[PDB]
Write a protein that binds this ligand. Structure first.
Ligand SMILES: NC(=O)c1ccc[n+]([C@@H]2O[C@H](COP(=O)([O-])OP(=O)(O)OC[C@H]3O[C@@H](n4cnc5c(N)ncnc54)[C@H](O)[C@@H]3O)[C@@H](O)[C@H]2O)c1
Ligand SMILES: NC(=O)c1ccc[n+]([C@@H]2O[C@H](COP(=O)([O-])OP(=O)(O)OC[C@H]3O[C@@H](n4cnc5c(N)ncnc54)[C@H](O)[C@@H]3O)[C@@H](O)[C@H]2O)c1
Ligand SMILES: NC(=O)c1ccc[n+]([C@@H]2O[C@H](COP(=O)([O-])OP(=O)(O)OC[C@H]3O[C@@H](n4cnc5c(N)ncnc54)[C@H](O)[C@@H]3O)[C@@H](O)[C@H]2O)c1
Ligand SMILES: NC(=O)c1ccc[n+]([C@@H]2O[C@H](COP(=O)([O-])OP(=O)(O)OC[C@H]3O[C@@H](n4cnc5c(N)ncnc54)[C@H](O)[C@@H]3O)[C@@H](O)[C@H]2O)c1
Lengths: 337, 368, 368, 337
């Protein structure tokens, strides 16, 4: 029912698109979407994915203007300016900006300008957005935020458990790192990009970096700041990535102590959100997997009952979208506007 | 129905239950495999593939050598020698060669007497003797219970062949040569590791080795009427699993366009070459066929002709998945090929019947 | 040196012993026959050849279980079922398939299960599983662990093979076919007696039979280079034990005189074919090579040519005698390949045999 | 000058050989090898390398029995017997068994037991071998020590400065991890590996594991145990790995202060051994370079002035050899046993 169009029909565009098909009970009437890229491409792009494979969802469309897929015919155009991107022609309900290039509220404003009602950004918006993230900023979340954001998958995934750890054991200091994959955020080749590292090709090289995680943690976790700071490690992989953090937790504990604690959480709430296990499973074992990350039980060592390594294969793309999808439909509900 | 098992445990030893359990028509059933690595592994192995994804199946760990498959159980062997493997006790009608070392039905025979009624050869066995078994071509033309160790040529050709078959079949072709994209694998080491061959020695997934393809000959082996007209090079390339050749072919015929032949594909692919031969139209890549069992993926558009007659003929394909479907191919075939009923000889006239018992009959000492 | 056993004495095996007795440094030694014929008879039958004269060596006919011969007390079984007959207490590494009856590969299992570790299959390639291995021809293709059940293909083939390589190898054929002058034997009914065969059933000693023989096939078996390329029926002619080949072949070569080819033969004879390929020059007949063991028998002249490409290839040879002294060499080969002996030459270059065991080595998995 | 043989001789050995040549005045006259592989192969094994490219040195074999490199005759024995390998025809001084399979002193002794006299292994010598690493234990190594080994590249690489780590500030706790490359020891394609992780193909998946770095840490430095202990991560890369370690140091500090405290390290000790900088470089920009790593002084961030990030693209392969080749020279030096 939510007449929605997302900006930047990236993988996550397809993801949520697939999630639209994947997730059941989708009031997300996303009958339009934006990406300045070629739409029939995007169609085939939507049609054909690498990781989760081609979206076998056959779509029959008559004319460039109207496109229909799985009954839910869905428009899409290609343009840069959200004002040049008419939204009132549908009176758009929600937008998410997969481009990333609109990393400030103005574009959303500009999206709100052309006739959008609500906005969130999977990416941490530069500056003028208090982000919303499940587990962290979905509780005090208000549907009445016509413009909000998510953070990078990293934060979008690394959040809850350690907060609950912070809830159940506290953390003196946290040193978070990820196996952050590669994306358009980095240059395939050593193409000219602001971050020299993201500029490089690095087909097999990692990027020592720091995503908004150790920053968005501030918003999403009003407590865990500075003390609980690590960086990002943007790796030469395209796919589901892994958390790599060692904490100096506050309360004395040991490995399993958090595990069942981490278990029970997913056993009730991080259900769908996150997971935990110790069966050795590698990336391929996490295709289109939604429980953002199962945490290792063995290698999650604990030293002095505070120094605690943490590790979990996480879906930087689909589970991210999952999480992105999560509150997305939630704001569709409590549909104040 | 037919008692099945696997010699050893491979990625193809990992390949087929994905099909088989996912299958719906498989009469036979595996009951045991030689995982010399433990079910825990084998499960983690079989339950979780590297490419086709985790097995969408409750293949579960019943007892460490007898696990579950969504309720169906299967035993496990753990060994590297046929002779201890009690295919007799296992009653296995059909076992799949998973050592490779059996480039010879003889070694496979070391299971035949061991209670392998028939032996599923999987790869191009250097032992020529076994009739070259390939679907769409000679699959039926195989003789049941005649030398029950049953060949299976290189997926590359084994997939190429029915296509390669249909072309001259559609055309008549002076001869042919090609080059597939042999995906990176283990046989070529990730490292520049000490190798009986310079080529697969090197660090695998970076270098790109052209190499030898008896599979090219195997065409003649399966297309004897096409003998000698075959060539090409085995380009080992760095992919997980898809190979694809374009085949240079001086077509014996006129030299009309390919789309016609592709219409003939569109005819014959849709004809008997369903299951194997796809001519998709959207120009698409490796991913676009993963987990897809259409055991050949031709691109009419990308395929071209040179002089109208020298056709540049391509086809995407996986290297084991489709191959894993070749398993079922004879499997259900050899299943119905299995007699089940009895014979109608005359142990007086066909005293060889009586001699089948009375083998020490001077009445029977033929050629010996 | 190796304990050997007979499941009833092979007509050839009989002399083969005396041959083996005529052998000196034999890494093998028979210890028992499954005499379902009475010792003294078998003894006489052994001590007395019916063709090349009785043994010119003592045979001590000691008790119904074990006579001796020149101090060789050899035991006696009497049974068509091996398992019971314990070649293991007899430590018989490899048992003479003294029946033929177990023409089936799986027959020999009972004999492995009767105390064999390997199997001297006396039978030509009735089954398909086991390949025979041939001195000068395909012997060396054997390493150990390769088919402990090992065929004794037809002398016809077995004498066909040796020279038959030269052509495809030294000079190159297109294809061709042959025909033995098969001496008379017992496996054709002396009179018209009830026998499942058409012809051998008829009265033997007087006639000749155009006869089915996949020796040409069995060659192509061990000569995949000639797989599905050659032909030839047999001719059971009335002689005790000798035969010559028909052989005509469209040679690929220009059509040089045979003499050179025969010199090349003699060269190749001088090569790997000592005792194997005789290319003599005296025009001689059946007698003139009886009890002569040189496996081939050609008055180099005799084999000749029609127009070069088509080659009138013909050569006398033995059917049992030489045939026997072919069995030992290969029977020795296993002992020559027998474990316990130091067999390390070079892996720093030729580790091929080294990792021939394990292909998952540093890198050994050739052909994937 | 020191007659040396190499069992299990491999890349790192080949590296060591490319080192050996690059080690102008290499006091190891390594005239012998053990390698069951073929000679031309063994040539190409050294001759044709992937990472450092082919050996920039031509290889000639006369004809197949022996191969001469850089005008010096060399031998390569091939027999799986840990003794039969004729180390006595020369009475080998140093042996390097690549296979590592003799984690017990025995096989190495078995190598010594027919002429060989000294040993170092890529495998951490479990127990009956001196925990001997350059920067840390090559000195306390008395040349009477004959059969020693090197632990993990990681262990090998971290050793010197991580010793210097607790030097300059002391370390409350330490949990290290590596961006360890992919090799054939982990199943490069899915095969029967004990580690289910290391068992798959996983050309693009990581392997949670641990290392002698987590273990010899005590063996190389006593207090450095448990609290000073981490894990290993074999990652989808072929090349120079990075240390994923955050040291909970004792003395409060800020990042560069410790890097200042580690400028000197390169300036005095890590010279040749290790390095450090903050210009963003990637594994290739660490290729064939002998300073075992450069530390991301910048992203080796301080957090709470005790739990301090440590990050350094470390030469898991070439320096690893080099360090061992260094250690080899060390044992080439002081030659008594
Ligand atoms: N976890 C993170 O770090 C994170 C979070 C949010 C967004 N992102 C970035 O956004 C993308 C998220 O993953 P993805 O699967 O969607 O990959 P993606 O790169 O395909 O998604 C971005 C899409 O926006 C399009 N784009 C660029 N400029 C545009 C513009 N003016 N208007 C409309 N579209 C525009 C791109 O073509 C692309 O299709 C990635 O590019 C990623 O780099 C990353
Ligand atoms: N897929 C093809 O087209 C093709 C063609 C020719 C050869 N091959 C080779 O034949 C095999 C078939 O593919 P796959 O899916 O099975 O991958 P695979 O490589 O894992 O299969 C063979 C593997 O099984 C194991 N093995 C061998 N003997 C064993 C034994 N007695 N007991 C336990 N394990 C044993 C080894 O790990 C061996 O590498 C592969 O080695 C493949 O490389 C494949
Ligand atoms: N002599 C040869 O060169 C040769 C070789 C192969 C086959 N053949 C033909 O096939 C038969 C075998 O010939 P051969 O050379 O071995 O001499 P053979 O005929 O004497 O061999 C069989 C002998 O073993 C016994 N026998 C037969 N079947 C048996 C069985 N199931 N179990 C135990 N003992 C059995 C008999 O005593 C018989 O004499 C003969 O009929 C012969 O015509 C001959
Ligand atoms: N480079 C590192 O950082 C590191 C760290 C720890 C362990 N290792 C081990 O060391 C090896 C990498 O070192 P490398 O580049 O010098 O190549 P390498 O792989 O050839 O060195 C060791 C190899 O010797 C092989 N082997 C077993 N028996 C042998 C024999 N008779 N002859 C010859 N080789 C035999 C083993 O397969 C082993 O992989 C890998 O096997 C790896 O597992 C490496």
């Amino acid at each position: 029912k939510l007449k929605v169009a997302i900006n930047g029909f990236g993988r996550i565009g397809r993801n949520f698109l697939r999630c639209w098909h994947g997730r059941k009970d989708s009031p997300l009437d996303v009958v339009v979407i934006n990406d300045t890229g070629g739409v029939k491409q995007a169609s085939h792009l939507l049609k054909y994915d690498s990781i989760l494979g081609t979206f076998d969802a056959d779509v029959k469309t008559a004319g460039d203007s109207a496109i229909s897929v799985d009954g839910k015919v869905i428009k899409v155009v290609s343009d840069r300016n959200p004002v040049n991107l008419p939204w009132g022609d549908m009176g758009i309900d929600l937008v998410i900006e997969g481009t990333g290039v609109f990393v400030d509220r103005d574009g959303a404003g500009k999206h709100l300008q052309a006739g959008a009602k609500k906005v969130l950004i999977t990416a941490p918006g530069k500056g003028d957005i208090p982000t919303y993230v499940v587990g962290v900023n979905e509780e005090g979340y208000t549907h009445a935020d016509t413009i909000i954001s998510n953070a990078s998958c990293t934060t979008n995934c690394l959040a809850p458990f350690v907060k609950v750890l912070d809830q159940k054991f506290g953390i003196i200091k946290g040193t978070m790192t990820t196996t952050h994959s590669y994306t358009g955020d980095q240059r395939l080749l050593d193409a000219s990009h602001r971050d020299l590292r993201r500029a490089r090709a690095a087909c097999l090289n990692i990027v020592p970096t720091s995503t908004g995680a150790a920053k968005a943690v501030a918003l999403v976790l009003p407590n865990l700041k500075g003390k609980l700071n690590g960086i990002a490690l943007r790796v030469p992989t395209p796919n589901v990535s892994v958390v790599d953090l060692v904490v100096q937790v506050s309360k004395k504990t040991f490995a399993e102590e958090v595990n069942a604690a981490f278990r029970e959480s997913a056993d009730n709430e991080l259900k769908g959100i996150l997971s935990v296990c110790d069966e050795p499973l590698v990336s391929i074992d996490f295709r289109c997997t939604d429980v953002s990350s199962t945490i290792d039980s063995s290698l999650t060592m604990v030293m002095g009952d505070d120094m605690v390594k943490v590790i979990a294969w996480y879906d930087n793309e689909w589970g991210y979208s999952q999480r992105v999808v999560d509150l997305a439909d939630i704001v569709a509900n409590k549909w104040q506007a | 129905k037919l008692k099945v098992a696997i010699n050893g445990f491979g990625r193809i030893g990992r390949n087929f239950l994905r099909c088989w359990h996912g299958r719906k028509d498989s009469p036979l059933d595996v009951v045991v495999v030689n995982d010399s690595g433990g079910v825990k592994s084998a499960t983690h192995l079989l339950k979780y593939d590297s490419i086709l994804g985790t097995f969408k199946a409750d293949v579960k760990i019943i007892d460490n050598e007898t696990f579950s498959i969504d309720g169906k159980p299967i035993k496990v062997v753990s060994n590297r020698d046929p002779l201890k493997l009690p295919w007799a006790e296992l009653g296995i009608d059909i076992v799949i060669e998973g050592t490779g070392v059996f480039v010879d039905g003889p070694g496979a025979g070391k299971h035949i007497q061991a209670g392998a009624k028939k032996v599923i050869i999987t790869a191009p066995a250097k032992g020529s003797d076994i009739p070259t078994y390939v679907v769409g071509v000679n699959e039926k033309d195989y003789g049941h219970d005649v030398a029950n160790i049953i060949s299976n040529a290189s997926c590359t050709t084994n997939c190429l062949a029915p296509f390669v078959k249909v072309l001259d079949e559609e055309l008549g072709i002076v001869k042919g040569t090609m080059t597939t994209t042999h995906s990176y694998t283990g046989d070529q080491r990730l490292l520049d590791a000490s190798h009986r061959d310079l080529r697969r020695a090197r660090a695998a997934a970076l270098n790109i080795v052209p190499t030898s393809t008896g599979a090219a000959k195997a065409v003649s082996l399966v297309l004897p009427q096409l003998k000698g007209k075959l060539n090409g090079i085995a380009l080992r390339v760095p992919t997980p699993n898809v190979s694809v050749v374009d085949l240079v072919v001086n077509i014996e015929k006129v030299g009309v366009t390919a789309e016609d032949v592709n219409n003939a594909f569109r005819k014959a692919a849709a004809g008997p070459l369903k299951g194997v031969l796809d001519v998709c139209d959207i120009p698409l890549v490796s991913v676009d066929f993963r987990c897809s069992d259409f055991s050949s993926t031709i691109d009419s558009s990308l395929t071209m002709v040179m002089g109208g007659d020298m056709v540049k003929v391509v086809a995407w394909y996986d290297n084991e998945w489709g191959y894993s479907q070749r398993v079922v191919d004879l499997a259900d075939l050899v299943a119905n090929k299995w007699p089940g009923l009895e014979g109608s000889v005359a142990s007086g006239d066909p005293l060889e019947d009586f001699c089948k018992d009375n083998p020490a009959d001077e009445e029977c000492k033929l050629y010996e």
